[PDB]
Amino acid sequence: HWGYGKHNGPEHWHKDFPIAKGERQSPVDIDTHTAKYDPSLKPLSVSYDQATSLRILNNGHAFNVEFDDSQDKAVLKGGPLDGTYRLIQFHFHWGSLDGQGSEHTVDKKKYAAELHLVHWNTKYGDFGKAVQQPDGLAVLGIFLKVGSAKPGLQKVVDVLDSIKTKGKSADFTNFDPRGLLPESLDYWTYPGSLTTPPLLECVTWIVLKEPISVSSEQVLKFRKLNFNGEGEPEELMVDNWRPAQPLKNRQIKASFK
Ligand SMILES: NS(=O)(=O)c1ccc(B(O)O)cc1
Numbered sequence: 001h002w003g004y005g006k007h008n009g010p011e012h013w014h015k016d017f018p019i020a021k022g023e024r025q026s027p028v029d030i031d032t033h034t035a036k037y038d039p040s041l042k043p044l045s046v047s048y049d050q051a052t053s054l055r056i057l058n059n060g061h062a063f064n065v066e067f068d069d070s071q072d073k074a075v076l077k078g079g080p081l082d083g084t085y086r087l088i089q090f091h092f093h094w095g096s097l098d099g100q101g102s103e104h105t106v107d108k109k110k111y112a113a114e115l116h117l118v119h120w121n122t123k124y125g126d127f128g129k130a131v132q133q134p135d136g137l138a139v140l141g142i143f144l145k146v147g148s149a150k151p152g153l154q155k156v157v158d159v160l161d162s163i164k165t166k167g168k169s170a171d172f173t174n175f176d177p178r179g180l181l182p183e184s185l186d187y188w189t190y191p192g193s194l195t196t197p198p199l200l201e202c203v204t205w206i207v208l209k210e211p212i213s214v215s216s217e218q219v220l221k222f223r224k225l226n227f228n229g230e231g232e233p234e235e236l237m238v239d240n241w242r243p244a245q246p247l248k249n250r251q252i253k254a255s256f257k
């Protein structure tokens, strides 16, 4: 099946997932000189005060930190969004080197990694229903650059040794996602898709302008993960990012003038 190698990577996906060539695919390059300030954007509200993480899982493409989404405990509201979106998981995309790894790019600049906080619209009852709708998902994207260490990431970093290979999971309770946010919540927003198969066009993308800084040692531990399962030839989990897709007729709006 699909992956990120030379023979199953992003350029192959359209053979099994024809929507890969659709009209609102993600990620995209963010042209900062063409994104327009939108005064019609309400303030963005990240309410992670009562977030309840459960588990961390290596799914052979990335690792997911999974949250209890049975109640409105961690929710995203406001900005371009109508209603309440519940946090279900977060994960990262990263590169083999610090000059690549992010999915979105900013004036063609690639960051070392990108964090995706994935939320689903409560009006559709559950995640599986939401991804079938144009406004089903909201994904908050946060760029990572290599610099000083991110203390709020270290709990994630420390547990990766226990989920090295595909299918491994570990208990991951009392993790506070607020420690992964930058100082400012200025953002760009546009309508797009999941960036991995099934590539469904169901995402309101909210991409923060300000990156967070992580240490070289921290990203180094990301790169020690494996795509493969236990007891198999080792493939380091690196470069698990999809490149920028054509913007087509979409407009990127900026929350900041
Ligand atoms: N990388 S992303 O946030 O756009 C994403 C999130 C979820 C799924 B999925 O549930 O298959 C795929 C891609």
Ligand SMILES: [Zn+2]
Pocket: 091, 092, 093, 116, 195
């Ligand atoms: Zn992602």
